[PDB]
Amino acid sequence: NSAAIQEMNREVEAAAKRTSPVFLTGEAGSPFETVARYFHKNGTPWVSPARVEYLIDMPMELLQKAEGGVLYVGDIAQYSRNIQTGITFIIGKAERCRVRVIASCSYAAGSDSCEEKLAGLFSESVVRIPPL
Amino acid sequence: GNSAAIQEMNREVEAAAKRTSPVFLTGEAGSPFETVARYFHKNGTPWVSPARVEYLIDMPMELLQKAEGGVLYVGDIAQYSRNIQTGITFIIGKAERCRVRVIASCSYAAGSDSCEEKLAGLFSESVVRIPPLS
């Protein structure tokens, strides 16, 4: 309903149009799962690992379970660099397996560097050239 | 050369040097985009740049072939049409398997004044920000 919710809903419409990962960001305690679910289509898989270690131990099993659906990897704010690297492996295979990868990243209220974690999962690099 | 804003810029360059995915350079009109893009060039590998912008939609495989093991520098996208931008996306999606690294720039009017819509269109994910509730 809000004006902030309006803009957000614009970001989810732009996202709806693609097959690449969606990254949800917001304050600790945000409704991450309900927004992630806006990308779920009825009668397709919605897979979320029962345990975090599954992201590195059984990435292929999760991609298979999730075929034509979504692999929701959860909130990365407290994931180790290892799991983060696991997610990158899953990201680079998901298209082929026809899985859409969704991740969240929560941060402390008061906008407290999810950005370092997200930049590592993003599939490109940005370098900003200052004025001379 | 030297300053504190550069120092950071060079942080962004080093983090980028560590990867095979695209690199996107952003900065004001008249930035040395090409000299910075060239920091990712390794000696003896191809440095390929389309002589014509339309080559990006007309002959994407030819450019990827020329650039194998090197870089395809696609140029400054600030005034590229939606079509060309979609051409770059097609090229981005094949570059890895062809062992080509894609580099793009986007320039904006001085000041620091929607490069962001072009770039986010060539970015290989989407970000949705959930505002505070309660």
From TrEMBL, chain B:
Disulfide bonds: 106-115
Annotated transmembrane regions: none
Domain Sigma-54 factor interaction residues, every copy: 1-134
Descriptive protein name: Nitrogen assimilation regulatory protein NtrX
Organism: Neisseria gonorrhoeae (strain ATCC 700825 / FA 1090)
Region of the whole protein represented: 137 to 272 of 425
